[PDB]
Amino acid sequence: ELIKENMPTKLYMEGTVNNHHFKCTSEGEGKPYEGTQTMRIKVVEGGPLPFAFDILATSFSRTFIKHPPGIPDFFKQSFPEGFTWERVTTYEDGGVLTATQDTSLQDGCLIYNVKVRGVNFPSNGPVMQKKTLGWEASTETMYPADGGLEGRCDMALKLVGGGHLICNLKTTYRSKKPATKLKMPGVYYVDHRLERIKEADDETYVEQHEVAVARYCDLPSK
Secondary structure, X not given: OOOOOOEEEEEEEEEEEOOEEEEEEEEEEEEOOOOXXXXXXXXXXXXXXXXXXXXXXXXXXXXXOEOOOOOOOHHHHOOOOOEEXXXXXXXXXXXXXXXXXXXXXXXXXXXXXXXXXXXXXXXXXXXXXXXXXXXXOEEEEEEEEOOEEEEEEEEEEEEOOOOEEEEEEEEEEEEOOOHHHOOOOOOEEEEEEEEEEEEEOOOOEEEEEEEEEEEOOOOOOO
């Protein structure tokens, strides 16, 4: 329909982490019905960053989740109007990262505008010492609430040396489409894997790939 089998993306990000101002742009494409996509990211102001890029990774694309037929796709249904989200990520060592995003569809292209704000990352911790090795796979639970979706998950950042730094994510996804036009899902789950494919020049160029698939819980009941 409006969301084709192949779909290009463009993203504009602006933020500050521990008072460090920066900007990024990216471009990618993916297969929205297959749940895959790639993003090529450039830090265009404030580079090289004094924190691990990993903490921005999830801020760089909900349309590219594979929803099987029994699960109404909130995000795909939101077009042509699009949707927005806002998220708080709380790291167990005190860093907090907040992000808000607008998603819109313009002349065949998904356009993302993202504002990020990070505070209280410990100067001695692995994020500011850039001692991280990317994210483990994780599962996000989606709960319908008041016309929108509440996403919740935990994620863990691999550390150089072994071990993980754990964080908790809370997101609220809201549609710009009128609620009369949206079939809401029930509770469901999204499994994600987000991998870095390439990086250059002290993380001022990064290429990421995500795969994300929605499912219900297949565990037996009574």
